[PDB]
Structure formats: C-alpha cells, structure tokens
Amino acid sequence: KAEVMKEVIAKSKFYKQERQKAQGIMEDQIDNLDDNFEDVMSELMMTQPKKPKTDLDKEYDIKVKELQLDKRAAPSDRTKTEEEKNAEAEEKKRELEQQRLDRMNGSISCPRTHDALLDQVKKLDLDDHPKIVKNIIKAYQPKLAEGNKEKLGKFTAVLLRHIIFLSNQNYLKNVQSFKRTQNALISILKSLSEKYNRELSEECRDYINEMQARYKKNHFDALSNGDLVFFSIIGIL
C-alpha cells in the first residue's frame, strides 16, 4: 500500500510536470505567434476575397414581425385542488399559530405629509375619502416606477394620521357616512400595513411620543377621541 501510493503520487507529479512543460511550450508559441501577428495580417489583408436566404429563414423572420404586431397573453398558474389549497392554507395556520405562541412565552399626487392629503381631499365629500386614497395607491404602485415603495411607504404613515384626524373632527351630523369612511380607510390601512409595516411602525411610535408629550402639559385635555381610536387601530394592525 505504501509502495502503490508512492507510485500514484509519483505518477500524479509526473503528469503534472508534463502538463507544466506542455503549458511552458504552449505559452511560448503564443508569444512567437503574437510577434508575427502583424506580418501574417499584412499578407492576409492583401488576399482578402473580392466583394439568397433560405426559405425557412424568410418565414422565421416574417413570423417574428407578425408576432410583434399582435397582442400578448397573460399567463396564469395551475389551479390547485381544494384538498391542496385547504392543506396549504391549513399548513400556514400552524406555522403562524406556533410562532405566536413562542412570541407569547418570550395626475394623482401622492401626499408625503398629512396636510398635503387634506389639500387633495379638501374639496371632496367625506364619503369620497376611500375613493381618493385607493386611487393614490393604484396610481403609485411599486411596479409602475422606481421609488414608489417609498412614496407608498410614507403614504402609509400619512393615512394613519388621517384616520386619527377624522375621529378628532365632529361627526355627529353624519355618523353613518363617517362610519362608512373610517372602516373603509382602516381596511386600506391594513392592506398597506402588510407591505410597509416599517413606515407605519415608525409613525406609530412617534404618535406614542407625541401623545405622551401632550399629556405632560395638558393632562386629560390633550387626550381626544382619536387617541382612543389610535390605540384600537394598533390592536387591529
């Protein structure tokens, strides 16, 4: 065994040396060839030769042009069986449930600020607020352009301040209309929260600091109906 491996190691080294020797000769040939690069070209350019498509080729090119003109179809995924959909939706349930237990044991303008949104919705009726906010999301989706995530992300914070803002204002006149808007806005805020919790989270923590600061000076007077609403929304989201 000792003799065999030594022969094997010797054979491997021997072939390695040959490969290096072949490489050494190999590299030299390029250098000699490269040095003669100009002379070979001077003759070759002198001997350059003096100045129909397949029927298949004509068809293929014609197909590409015809294919460009017509419309393109949306491709759609396989329909999973109800047993598979149930199981996959069911499997997600333990995963989400189990994590919770472990945590338990330890044209359209996008307003970057709250005031900007009011100006856009200043002339609209109260019941139209869900319409305008939804369009802003549609007008500035992430895919449409670069940087839309940030614009939507900030708009998530703007939407939160608006829902608290409406609650502060008087609504006893049109409670039914007011009810139709807060829940509609809150549901939209829930959809936004799924993708932009970072921006909502930062806005949420700032409001807590603002709420505390106003409490230090004003006591119960700072507290408002929206403040109760604000705590409720956090539980929702």
Partner 1 sequence: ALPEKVIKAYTTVGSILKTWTHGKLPKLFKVIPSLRNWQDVIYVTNPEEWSPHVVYEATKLFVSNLTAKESQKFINLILLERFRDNIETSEDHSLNYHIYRAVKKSLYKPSAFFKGFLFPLVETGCNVREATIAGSVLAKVSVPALHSSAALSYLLRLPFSPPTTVFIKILLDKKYALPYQTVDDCVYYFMRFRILSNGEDATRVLPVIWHKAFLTFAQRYKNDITQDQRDFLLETVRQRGHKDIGPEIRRELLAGASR
Partner RNA sequence: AAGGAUUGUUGAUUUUGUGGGUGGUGGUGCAGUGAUGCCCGUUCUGGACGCGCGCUACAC
In eight-state DSSP terms, residue 91 is H
Residues in region 67-106 near partner 1 by CB under 8 A: 67-68, 70-79
Neighbour count for residue 148 (Cβ, 10 Å): 17
- 146 part of the interface to RNA, by CB under 7 A: yes
Specify whether the CB–CB gap between 166 and 178 falls below 8 A: yes
- 20 part of the interface to RNA, by CB under 7 A: yes
- 63 part of the interface to RNA, by CB under 7 A: no
CB of 152 to RNA, least distance (A): 10
Stretch that binds partner 1, among 44-52, 85-93, 140-148, 173-181 (CB under 8 A): 44-52
Cα–Cα distance for residue pair 149/155, rounded to 1 Å: 9
- 60 part of the interface to partner 1, by CB under 8 A: yes
- Which of 1, 37, 94, 209 contacts partner 1 by CB under 8 A? 37
Could you tell me which residues come within 8 angstroms of residue 37 by beta carbon, excluding any fewer than 6 positions away? none
DSSP conformation letters of 176-212: HHHHHHHHHHHHHHHHHHHH-HHHHHHHHHHHHHHHH
Residue 216, token pair as written in the block? 């230090």
Stretch that binds RNA, among 100-108, 141-149, 180-188, 209-217 (CB under 7 A): 141-149
Specify whether the CB–CB gap between 110 and 155 falls below 8 A: yes
Could you tell me which residues come within 8 angstroms of residue 195 by beta carbon, excluding any fewer than 6 positions away? 149, 152
Site mask for RNA (CB under 7 A), range 188-207, x = bound = -------x------------
Cα–Cα distance for residue pair 12/26, rounded to 1 Å: 20
CB of 153 to RNA, least distance (A): 11
Stretch that binds partner 1, among 9-17, 43-51, 106-114, 142-150 (CB under 8 A): 43-51
- 149 part of the interface to RNA, by CB under 7 A: yes
Site mask for partner 1 (CB under 8 A), range 17-36, x = bound = -----x---xx-xx--xx-x
Residue among 236, 235, 233, 228 at smallest CA distance from 211: 228
Cα–Cα distance for residue pair 174/113, rounded to 1 Å: 26
- The residues that touch RNA, with contacts defined as CB under 7 A, are 9, 12, 16, 19-20, 141-143, 146, 148-149, 195
- The residues that touch partner 1, with contacts defined as CB under 8 A, are 22, 26-27, 29-30, 33-34, 36-37, 39-41, 43-44, 46-49, 56-57, 59-61, 63-64, 66-68, 70-79
